[PDB]
Coordinates of C-alpha atoms and ligand atoms in Angstrom, one line a residue:
Chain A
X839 CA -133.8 10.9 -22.3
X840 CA -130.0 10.7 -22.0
X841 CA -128.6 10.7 -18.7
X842 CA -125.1 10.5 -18.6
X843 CA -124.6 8.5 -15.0
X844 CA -126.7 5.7 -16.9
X845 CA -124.6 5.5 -19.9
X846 CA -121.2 6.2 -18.6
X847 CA -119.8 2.6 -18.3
X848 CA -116.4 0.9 -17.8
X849 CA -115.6 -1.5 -20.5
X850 CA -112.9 -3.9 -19.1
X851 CA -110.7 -6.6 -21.6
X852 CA -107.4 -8.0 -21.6
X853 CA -104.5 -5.6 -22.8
X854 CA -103.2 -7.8 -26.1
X855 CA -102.8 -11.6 -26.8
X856 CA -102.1 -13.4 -29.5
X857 CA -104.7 -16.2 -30.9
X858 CA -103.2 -19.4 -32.7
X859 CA -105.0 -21.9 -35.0
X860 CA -102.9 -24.2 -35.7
X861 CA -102.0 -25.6 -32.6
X862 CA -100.4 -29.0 -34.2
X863 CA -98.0 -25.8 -35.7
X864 CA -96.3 -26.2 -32.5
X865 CA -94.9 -29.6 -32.4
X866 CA -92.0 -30.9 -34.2
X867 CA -92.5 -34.2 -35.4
X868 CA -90.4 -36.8 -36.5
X869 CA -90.3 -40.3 -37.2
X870 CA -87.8 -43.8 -37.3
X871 CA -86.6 -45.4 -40.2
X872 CA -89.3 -47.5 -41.6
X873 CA -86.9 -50.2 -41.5
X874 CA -87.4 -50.0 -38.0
X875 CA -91.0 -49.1 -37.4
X876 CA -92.8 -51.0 -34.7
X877 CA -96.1 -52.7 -33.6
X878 CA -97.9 -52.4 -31.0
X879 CA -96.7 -55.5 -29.8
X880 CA -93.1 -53.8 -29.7
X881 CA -92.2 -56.1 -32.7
X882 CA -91.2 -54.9 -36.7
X883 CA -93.9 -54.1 -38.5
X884 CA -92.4 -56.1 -41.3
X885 CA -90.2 -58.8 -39.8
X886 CA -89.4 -60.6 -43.3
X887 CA -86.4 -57.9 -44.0
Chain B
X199 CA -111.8 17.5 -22.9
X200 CA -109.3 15.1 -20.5
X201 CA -106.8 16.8 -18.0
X202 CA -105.0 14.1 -17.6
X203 CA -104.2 12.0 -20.5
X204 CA -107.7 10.1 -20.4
X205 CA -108.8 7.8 -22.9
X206 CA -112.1 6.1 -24.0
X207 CA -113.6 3.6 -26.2
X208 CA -114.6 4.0 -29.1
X209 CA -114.8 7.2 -31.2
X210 CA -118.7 7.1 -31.0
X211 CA -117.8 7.7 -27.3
X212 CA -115.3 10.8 -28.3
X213 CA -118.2 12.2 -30.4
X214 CA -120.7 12.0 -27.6
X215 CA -118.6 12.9 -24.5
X216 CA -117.3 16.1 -26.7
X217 CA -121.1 17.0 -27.2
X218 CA -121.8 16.7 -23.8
X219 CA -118.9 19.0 -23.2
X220 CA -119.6 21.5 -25.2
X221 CA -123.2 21.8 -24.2
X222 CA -124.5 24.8 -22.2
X223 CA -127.3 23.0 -20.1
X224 CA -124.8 20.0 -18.9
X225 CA -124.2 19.7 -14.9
X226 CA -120.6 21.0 -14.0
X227 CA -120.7 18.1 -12.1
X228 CA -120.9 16.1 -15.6
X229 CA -118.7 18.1 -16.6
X230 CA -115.7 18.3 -14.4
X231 CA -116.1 14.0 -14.6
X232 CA -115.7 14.0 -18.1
X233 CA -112.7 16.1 -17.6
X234 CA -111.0 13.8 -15.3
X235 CA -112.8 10.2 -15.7
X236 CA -109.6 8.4 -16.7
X237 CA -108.6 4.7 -18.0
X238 CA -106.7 2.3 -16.2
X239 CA -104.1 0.2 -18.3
X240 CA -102.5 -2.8 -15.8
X241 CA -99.5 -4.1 -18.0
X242 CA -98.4 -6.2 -15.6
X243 CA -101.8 -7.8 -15.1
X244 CA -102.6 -7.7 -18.8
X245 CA -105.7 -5.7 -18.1
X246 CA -107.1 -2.8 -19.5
X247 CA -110.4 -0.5 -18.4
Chain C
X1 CA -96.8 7.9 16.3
X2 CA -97.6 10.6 13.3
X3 CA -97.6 7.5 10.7
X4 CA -99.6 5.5 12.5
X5 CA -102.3 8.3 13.4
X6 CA -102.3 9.0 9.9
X7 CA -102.6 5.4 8.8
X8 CA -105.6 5.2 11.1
X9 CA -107.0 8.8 10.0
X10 CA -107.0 7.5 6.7
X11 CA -108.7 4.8 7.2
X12 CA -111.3 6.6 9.2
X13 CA -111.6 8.9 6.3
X14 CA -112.1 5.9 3.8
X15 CA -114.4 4.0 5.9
X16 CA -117.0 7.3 6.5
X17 CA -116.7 8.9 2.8
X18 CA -116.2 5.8 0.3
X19 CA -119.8 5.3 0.4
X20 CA -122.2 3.6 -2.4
X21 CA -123.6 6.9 -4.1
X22 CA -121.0 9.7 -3.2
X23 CA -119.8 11.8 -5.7
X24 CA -116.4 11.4 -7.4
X25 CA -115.5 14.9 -6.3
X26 CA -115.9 14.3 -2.5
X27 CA -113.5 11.7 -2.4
X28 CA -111.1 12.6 -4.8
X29 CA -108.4 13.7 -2.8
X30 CA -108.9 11.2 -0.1
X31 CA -108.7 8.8 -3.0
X32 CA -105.4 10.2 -3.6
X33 CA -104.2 9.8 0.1
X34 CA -105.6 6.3 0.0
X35 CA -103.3 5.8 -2.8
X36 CA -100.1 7.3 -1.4
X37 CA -100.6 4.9 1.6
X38 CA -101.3 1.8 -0.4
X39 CA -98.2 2.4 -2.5
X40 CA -96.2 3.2 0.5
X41 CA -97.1 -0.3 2.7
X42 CA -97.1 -2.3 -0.4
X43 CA -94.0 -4.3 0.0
X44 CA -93.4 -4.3 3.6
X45 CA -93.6 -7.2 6.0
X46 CA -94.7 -6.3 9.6
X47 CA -94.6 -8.1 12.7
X48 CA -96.7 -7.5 15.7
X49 CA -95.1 -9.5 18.3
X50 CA -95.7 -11.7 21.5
X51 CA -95.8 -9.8 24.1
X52 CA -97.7 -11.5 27.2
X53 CA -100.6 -13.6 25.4
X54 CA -100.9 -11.2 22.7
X55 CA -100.4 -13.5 19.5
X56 CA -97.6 -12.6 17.1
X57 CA -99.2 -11.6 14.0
X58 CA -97.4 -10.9 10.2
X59 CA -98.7 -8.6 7.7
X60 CA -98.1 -8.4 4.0
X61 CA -99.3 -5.7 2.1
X62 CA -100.1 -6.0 -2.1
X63 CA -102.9 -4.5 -2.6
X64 CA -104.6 -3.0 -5.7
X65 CA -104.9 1.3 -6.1
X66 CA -108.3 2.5 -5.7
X67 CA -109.3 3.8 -9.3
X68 CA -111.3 6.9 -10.1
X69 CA -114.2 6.1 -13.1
X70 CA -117.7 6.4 -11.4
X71 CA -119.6 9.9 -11.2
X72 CA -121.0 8.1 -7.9
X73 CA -119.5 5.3 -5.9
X74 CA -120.8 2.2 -6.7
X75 CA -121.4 -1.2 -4.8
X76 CA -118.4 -3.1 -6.2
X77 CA -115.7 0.1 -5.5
X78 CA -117.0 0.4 -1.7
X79 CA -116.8 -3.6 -1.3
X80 CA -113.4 -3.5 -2.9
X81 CA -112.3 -0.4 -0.7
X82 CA -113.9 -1.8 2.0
X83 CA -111.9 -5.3 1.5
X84 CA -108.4 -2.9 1.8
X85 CA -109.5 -1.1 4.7
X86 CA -110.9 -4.1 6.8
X87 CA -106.9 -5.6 6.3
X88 CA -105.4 -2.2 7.0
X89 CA -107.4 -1.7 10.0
X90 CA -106.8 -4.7 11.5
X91 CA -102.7 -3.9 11.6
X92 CA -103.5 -0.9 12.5
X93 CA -105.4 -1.8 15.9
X94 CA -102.6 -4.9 16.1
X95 CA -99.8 -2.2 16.1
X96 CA -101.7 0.0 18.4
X97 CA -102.4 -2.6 20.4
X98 CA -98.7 -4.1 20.4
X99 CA -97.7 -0.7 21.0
X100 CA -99.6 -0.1 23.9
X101 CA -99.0 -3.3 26.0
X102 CA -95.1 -1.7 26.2
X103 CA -92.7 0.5 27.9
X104 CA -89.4 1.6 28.7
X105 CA -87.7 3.7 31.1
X106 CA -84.7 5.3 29.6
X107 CA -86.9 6.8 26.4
X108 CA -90.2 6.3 27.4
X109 CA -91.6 8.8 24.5
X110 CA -90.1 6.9 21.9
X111 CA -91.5 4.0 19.8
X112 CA -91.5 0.5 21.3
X113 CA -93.0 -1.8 19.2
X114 CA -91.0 -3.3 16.3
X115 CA -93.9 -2.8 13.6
X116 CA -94.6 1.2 14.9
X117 CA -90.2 1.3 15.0
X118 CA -90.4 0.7 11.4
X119 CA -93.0 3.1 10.8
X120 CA -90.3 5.9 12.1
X121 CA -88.5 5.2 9.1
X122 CA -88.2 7.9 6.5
X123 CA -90.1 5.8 3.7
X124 CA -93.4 5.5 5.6
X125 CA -93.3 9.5 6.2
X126 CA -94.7 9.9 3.0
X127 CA -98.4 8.6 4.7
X128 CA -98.2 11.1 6.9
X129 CA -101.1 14.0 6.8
X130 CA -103.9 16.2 8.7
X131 CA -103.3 15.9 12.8
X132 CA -106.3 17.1 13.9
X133 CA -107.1 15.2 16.7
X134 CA -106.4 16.7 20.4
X135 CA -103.6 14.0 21.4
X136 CA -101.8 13.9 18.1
X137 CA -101.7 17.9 18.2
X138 CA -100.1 17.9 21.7
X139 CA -97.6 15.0 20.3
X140 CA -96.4 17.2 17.9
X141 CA -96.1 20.2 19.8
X142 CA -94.4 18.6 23.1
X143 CA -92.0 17.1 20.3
X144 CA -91.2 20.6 19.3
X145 CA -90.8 21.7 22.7
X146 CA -94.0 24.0 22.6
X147 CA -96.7 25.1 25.1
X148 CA -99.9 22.5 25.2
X149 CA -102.2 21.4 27.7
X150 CA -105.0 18.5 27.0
X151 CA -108.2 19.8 28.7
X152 CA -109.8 17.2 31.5
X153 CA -112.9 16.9 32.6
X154 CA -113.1 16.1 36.3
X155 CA -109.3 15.2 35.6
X156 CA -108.1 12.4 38.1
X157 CA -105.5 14.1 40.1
X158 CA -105.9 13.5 43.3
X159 CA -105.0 9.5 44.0
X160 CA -107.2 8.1 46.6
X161 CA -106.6 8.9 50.1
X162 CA -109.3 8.4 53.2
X163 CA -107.3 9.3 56.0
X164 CA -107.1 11.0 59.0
X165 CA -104.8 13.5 61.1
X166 CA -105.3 13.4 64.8
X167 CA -103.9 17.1 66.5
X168 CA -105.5 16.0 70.1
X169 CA -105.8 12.6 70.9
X170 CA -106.0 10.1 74.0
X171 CA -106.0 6.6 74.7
X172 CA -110.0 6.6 75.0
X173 CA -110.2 8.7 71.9
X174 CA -113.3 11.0 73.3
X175 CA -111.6 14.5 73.5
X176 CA -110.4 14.6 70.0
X177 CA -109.5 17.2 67.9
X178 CA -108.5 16.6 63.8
X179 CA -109.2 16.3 60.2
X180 CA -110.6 13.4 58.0
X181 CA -110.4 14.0 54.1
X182 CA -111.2 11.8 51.0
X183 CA -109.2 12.6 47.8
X184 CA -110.5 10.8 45.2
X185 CA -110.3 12.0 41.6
X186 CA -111.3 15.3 41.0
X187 CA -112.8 15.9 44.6
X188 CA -111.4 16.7 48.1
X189 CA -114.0 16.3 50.3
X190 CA -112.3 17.1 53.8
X191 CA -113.7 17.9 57.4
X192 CA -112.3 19.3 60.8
X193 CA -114.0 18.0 63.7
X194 CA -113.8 19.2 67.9
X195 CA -114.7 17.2 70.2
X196 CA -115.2 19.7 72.9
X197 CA -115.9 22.9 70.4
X198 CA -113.8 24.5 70.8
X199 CA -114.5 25.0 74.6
X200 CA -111.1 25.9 76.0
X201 CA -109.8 27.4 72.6
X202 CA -107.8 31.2 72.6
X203 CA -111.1 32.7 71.3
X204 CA -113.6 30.0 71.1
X205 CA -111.5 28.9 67.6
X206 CA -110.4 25.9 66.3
X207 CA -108.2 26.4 62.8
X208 CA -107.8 23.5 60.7
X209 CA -105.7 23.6 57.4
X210 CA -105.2 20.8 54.7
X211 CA -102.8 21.0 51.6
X212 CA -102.9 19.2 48.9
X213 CA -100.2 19.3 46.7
X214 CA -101.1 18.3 43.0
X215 CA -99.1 16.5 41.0
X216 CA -99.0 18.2 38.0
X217 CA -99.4 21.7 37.6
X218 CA -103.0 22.5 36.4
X219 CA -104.4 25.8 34.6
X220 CA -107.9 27.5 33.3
X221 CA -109.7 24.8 36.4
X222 CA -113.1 25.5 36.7
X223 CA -114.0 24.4 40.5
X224 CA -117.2 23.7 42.6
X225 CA -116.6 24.8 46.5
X226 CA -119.6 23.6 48.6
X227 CA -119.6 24.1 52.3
X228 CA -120.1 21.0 53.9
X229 CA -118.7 17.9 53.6
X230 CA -121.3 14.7 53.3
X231 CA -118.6 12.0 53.5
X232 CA -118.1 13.2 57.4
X233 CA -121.4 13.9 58.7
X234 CA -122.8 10.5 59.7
X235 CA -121.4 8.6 62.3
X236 CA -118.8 6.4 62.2
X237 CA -116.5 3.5 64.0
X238 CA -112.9 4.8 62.6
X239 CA -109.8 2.3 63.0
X240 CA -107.3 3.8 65.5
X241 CA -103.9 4.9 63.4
X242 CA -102.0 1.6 64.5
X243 CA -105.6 -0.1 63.9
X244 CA -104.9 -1.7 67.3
X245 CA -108.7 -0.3 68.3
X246 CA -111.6 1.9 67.2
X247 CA -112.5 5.4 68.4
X248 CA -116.2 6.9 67.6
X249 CA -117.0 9.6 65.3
X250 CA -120.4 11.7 66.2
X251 CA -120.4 14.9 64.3
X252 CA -122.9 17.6 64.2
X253 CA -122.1 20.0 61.3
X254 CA -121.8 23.7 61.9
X255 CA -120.8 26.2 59.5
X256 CA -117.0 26.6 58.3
X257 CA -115.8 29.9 59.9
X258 CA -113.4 32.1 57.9
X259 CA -113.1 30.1 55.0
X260 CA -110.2 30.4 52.6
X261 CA -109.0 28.4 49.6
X262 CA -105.8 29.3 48.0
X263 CA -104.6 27.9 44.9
X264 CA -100.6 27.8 44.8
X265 CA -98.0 28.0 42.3
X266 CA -94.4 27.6 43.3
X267 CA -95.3 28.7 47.1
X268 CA -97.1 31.9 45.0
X269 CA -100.8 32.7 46.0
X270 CA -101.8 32.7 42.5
X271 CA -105.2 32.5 43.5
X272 CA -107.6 33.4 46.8
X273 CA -111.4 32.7 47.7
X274 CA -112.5 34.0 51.3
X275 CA -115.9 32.9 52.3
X276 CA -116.5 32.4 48.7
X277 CA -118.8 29.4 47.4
X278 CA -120.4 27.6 44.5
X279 CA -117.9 28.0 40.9
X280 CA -114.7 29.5 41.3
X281 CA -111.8 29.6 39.0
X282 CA -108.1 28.6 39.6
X283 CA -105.9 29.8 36.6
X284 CA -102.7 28.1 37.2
X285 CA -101.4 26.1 40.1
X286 CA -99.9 23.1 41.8
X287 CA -101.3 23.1 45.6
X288 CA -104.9 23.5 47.1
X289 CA -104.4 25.0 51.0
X290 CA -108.0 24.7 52.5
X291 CA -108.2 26.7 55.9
X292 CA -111.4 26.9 57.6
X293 CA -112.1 27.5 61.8
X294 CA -114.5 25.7 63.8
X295 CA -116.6 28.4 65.3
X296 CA -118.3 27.8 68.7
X297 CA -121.9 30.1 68.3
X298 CA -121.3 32.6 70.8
X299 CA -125.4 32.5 71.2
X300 CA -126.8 29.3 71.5
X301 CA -130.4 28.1 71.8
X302 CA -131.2 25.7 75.1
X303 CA -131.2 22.7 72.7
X304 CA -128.0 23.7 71.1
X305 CA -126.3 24.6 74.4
X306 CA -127.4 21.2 75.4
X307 CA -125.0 19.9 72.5
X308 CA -121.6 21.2 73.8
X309 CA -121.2 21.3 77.4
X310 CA -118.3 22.9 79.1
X311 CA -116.5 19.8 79.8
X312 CA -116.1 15.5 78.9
X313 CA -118.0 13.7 78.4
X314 CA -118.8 15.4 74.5
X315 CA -121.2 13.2 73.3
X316 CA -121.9 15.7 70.1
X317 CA -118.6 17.1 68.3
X318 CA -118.6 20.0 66.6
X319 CA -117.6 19.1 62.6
X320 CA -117.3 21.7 59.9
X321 CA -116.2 20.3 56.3
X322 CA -115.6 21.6 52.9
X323 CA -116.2 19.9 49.8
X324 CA -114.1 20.7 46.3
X325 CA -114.5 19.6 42.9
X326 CA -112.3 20.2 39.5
X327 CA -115.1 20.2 37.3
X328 CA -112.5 21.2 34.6
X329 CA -109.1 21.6 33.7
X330 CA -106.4 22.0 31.3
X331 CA -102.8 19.8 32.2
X332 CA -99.5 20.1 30.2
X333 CA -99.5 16.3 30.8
X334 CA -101.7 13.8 30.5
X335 CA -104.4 12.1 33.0
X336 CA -107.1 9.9 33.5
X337 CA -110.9 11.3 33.2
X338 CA -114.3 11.1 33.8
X339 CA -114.9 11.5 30.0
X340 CA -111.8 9.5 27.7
X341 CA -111.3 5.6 27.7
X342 CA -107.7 6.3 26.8
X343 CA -106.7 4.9 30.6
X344 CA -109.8 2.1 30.3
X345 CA -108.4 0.8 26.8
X346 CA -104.8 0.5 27.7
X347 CA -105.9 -1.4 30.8
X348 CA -108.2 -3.3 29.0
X349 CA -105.6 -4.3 26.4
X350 CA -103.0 -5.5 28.9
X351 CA -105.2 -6.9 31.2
X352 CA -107.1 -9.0 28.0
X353 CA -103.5 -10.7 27.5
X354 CA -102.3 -11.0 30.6
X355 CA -99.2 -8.8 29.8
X356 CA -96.4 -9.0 32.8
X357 CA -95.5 -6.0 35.1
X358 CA -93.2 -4.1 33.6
X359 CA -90.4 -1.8 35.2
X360 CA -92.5 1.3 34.5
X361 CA -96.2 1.4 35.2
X362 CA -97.4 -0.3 38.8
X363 CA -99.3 -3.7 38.5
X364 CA -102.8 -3.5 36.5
X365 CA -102.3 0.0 35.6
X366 CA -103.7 0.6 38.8
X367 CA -104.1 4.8 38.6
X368 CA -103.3 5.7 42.1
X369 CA -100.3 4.1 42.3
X370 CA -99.6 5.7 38.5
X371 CA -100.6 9.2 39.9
X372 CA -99.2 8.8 43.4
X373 CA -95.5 8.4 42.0
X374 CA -96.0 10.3 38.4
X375 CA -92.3 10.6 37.0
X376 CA -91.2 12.1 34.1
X377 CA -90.6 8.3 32.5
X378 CA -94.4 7.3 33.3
X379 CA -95.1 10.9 32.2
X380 CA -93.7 9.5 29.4
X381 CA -94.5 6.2 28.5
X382 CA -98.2 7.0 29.8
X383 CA -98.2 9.7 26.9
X384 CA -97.4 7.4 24.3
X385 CA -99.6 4.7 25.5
X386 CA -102.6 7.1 25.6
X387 CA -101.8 9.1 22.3
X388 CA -102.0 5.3 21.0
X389 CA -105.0 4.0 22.1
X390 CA -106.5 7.7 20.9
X391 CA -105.5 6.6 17.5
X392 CA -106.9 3.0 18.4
X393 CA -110.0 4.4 18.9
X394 CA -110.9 6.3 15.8
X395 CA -111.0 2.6 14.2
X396 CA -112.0 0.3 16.9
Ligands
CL901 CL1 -120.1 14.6 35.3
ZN902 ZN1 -119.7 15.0 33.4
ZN903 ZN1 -106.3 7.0 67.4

């Protein structure tokens, strides 16, 4: 049978947010002139010039 | 049937609480609650019930 | 006074009827008035201070509405109501308490606390509803200048007195002639006593009279009138007035002769009982005159003869008594009784935090010394303090 005190419920949720994919969207990303790219050892990659 | 603005989710839940209005062997009780049960909207918490 | 009553009356009121399983509609408008006060003391800070060793406390309200979405209450809505009024009833007994551990003698009626100060303030007045109770009724109609008595039972108006009144006396204290009385409370138990019966009297009559003059005027009394007194029939090694010896007391009772109370208003007999005993009823007065007579039996039997001889030594004096008791009255003012803690909780409070003497009330709240010199400013002050600790006590 229906009973209405056992099916009247309160649903709670957020009012509204937005969901985002691409998160790497976000950042702005540059880089140096090759000319002056480094190593990890702080040095040129390409020292010859 | 609200008195006071209410709300509810979804439609299916308009349909049934309108039956349940309408119908002669429903509590007053039931009846008066469905009347006045209301939602509760918290913007500033971004909540919603 | 009115916001904090209410504050507490609420709270009351959402403690008894925000119960797992009520319905919606029972609570509905208390729901609402639970709301109102919420939204009113959100927002305010309040300080109850440090008065004596009562620890300075702060109070921020932000609390959540109540919402209204269950046909019956629930577990989680009573534990969240329950939460809010756990926090509001603690500041509430905190400013009752702060409240009541202060005075004043210029406006002794008026707020004293900072936190209940701030409560007088128009903004709070929105909390304000029903005053039902007996002390917060009489508040608000001695603030509007109207007629209102609180109704005692066994009201303590009489501050304690054993004492004595010598009318024939002697060095060797064995022809004497006087009353004893105890005032304590709500009874006057007083005796006359003759050491020689009344021997030598015009007509074999002793009179003895004792007024009592009541400080406060008291109306509708219901009073007990019994004949003898039992405080004054044993016998007894009384101090001498000076105390510098002791006489002794022998009494054999007889009956009180010509008995006549008289309950006074204004030097008015308002009310007169001749010869009358057991419940009687003053309706308005300020003074009790007591006169009773010693009779000596004009027929005596050989043992009683043998009692009262014709002159000293008296080794038997003749004692007749009289004992009264206010089972009930009603007072314009306030006063200590046999039935309300309002006098036991504010003594309690100040005595629990050692708070210092102040310029109003006598040391320890000590009730004779209150009653014995009741002026309008302790009238006052004792009002507030009481009609606090009422509202204290509908919560703690
Ligand atoms: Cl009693
Ligand atoms: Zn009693
Ligand atoms: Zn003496």
């Amino acid at each position: 049978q229906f009973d209405f005190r056992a099916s009247m419920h309160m649903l709670t949720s957020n009012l509204t947010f937005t969901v985002y994919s691409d998160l790497l969207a976000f950042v702005s990303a540059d880089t140096v002139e090759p000319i002056n790219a480094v190593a990890f050892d702080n040095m040129r990659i390409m020292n010859e010039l | 049937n609200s008195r006071d603005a209410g709300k509810v989710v979804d439609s299916e839940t308009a349909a049934i609480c309108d039956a349940i209005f309408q119908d002669e062997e429903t509590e007053g009780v039931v009846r008066r609650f469905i009347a006045e049960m209301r939602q509760r909207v918290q913007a500033d918490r971004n909540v919603v019930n | 006074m009115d916001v904090l009553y209410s504050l507490s009356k609420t709270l009351k009121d959402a403690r008894d009827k925000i119960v797992e399983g009520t319905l919606y509609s029972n609570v509905s408008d208390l729901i609402q008035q639970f709301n109102q006060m919420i939204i009113t003391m959100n927002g305010n800070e309040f300080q109850t201070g440090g008065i004596g060793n009562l620890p300075i406390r702060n109070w921020n309200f932000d609390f959540g509405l109540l919402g209204t979405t269950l046909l019956n209450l629930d577990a989680n809505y009573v534990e969240t109501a329950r939460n809010t009024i756990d926090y509001f009833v603690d500041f509430v007994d905190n400013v009752c308490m702060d409240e009541m551990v202060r005075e004043s003698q210029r406006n002794g009626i008026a707020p004293q606390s900072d936190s209940l100060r701030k409560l007088s303030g128009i903004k709070f007045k929105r909390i304000n509803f029903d005053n039902s109770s007996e002390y917060i009724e009489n508040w608000n109609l001695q603030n509007r200048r109207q007629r209102t008595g609180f109704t005692f039972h066994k009201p303590n108006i009489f501050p304690y007195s054993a004492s004595f009144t010598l009318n024939r006396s002697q060095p060797a204290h064995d022809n004497l002639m006087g009353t004893m009385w105890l005032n304590a409370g709500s009874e006057i138990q007083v005796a006359g006593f003759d050491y020689s019966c009344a021997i030598n009297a015009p007509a074999n009559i002793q009179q003895f009279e004792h007024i009592v003059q009541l400080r406060r005027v008291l109306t509708t009394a219901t009073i007990t009138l019994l004949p003898d007194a039992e405080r004054f029939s044993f016998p007894r090694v009384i101090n001498s007035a000076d105390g510098a010896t002791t006489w002794y007391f022998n009494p054999v009772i007889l009956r009180p002769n010509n008995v006549e109370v008289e309950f006074l208003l204004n030097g008015q007999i308002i009310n007169t009982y001749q010869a009358r005993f057991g419940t009687i009823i003053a309706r308005n007065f300020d003074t009790i005159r007591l006169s009773f007579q010693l009779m000596r039996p004009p027929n005596m039997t050989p043992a009683v003869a043998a009692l009262f001889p014709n002159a000293q030594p008296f080794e038997h004096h003749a004692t007749v008594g009289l004992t009264l008791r206010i089972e009930s009255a009603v007072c314009e003012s306030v006063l200590a009784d046999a039935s309300k803690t309002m006098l036991a909780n504010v003594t309690s409070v100040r005595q629990e935090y050692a708070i210092p003497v102040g310029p109003v009330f006598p040391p320890g709240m000590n009730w004779t010394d209150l009653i014995t010199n009741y002026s309008p400013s302790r009238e006052d002050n004792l009002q507030r303090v009481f009609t606090v600790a009422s509202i204290r006590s509908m919560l703690v």
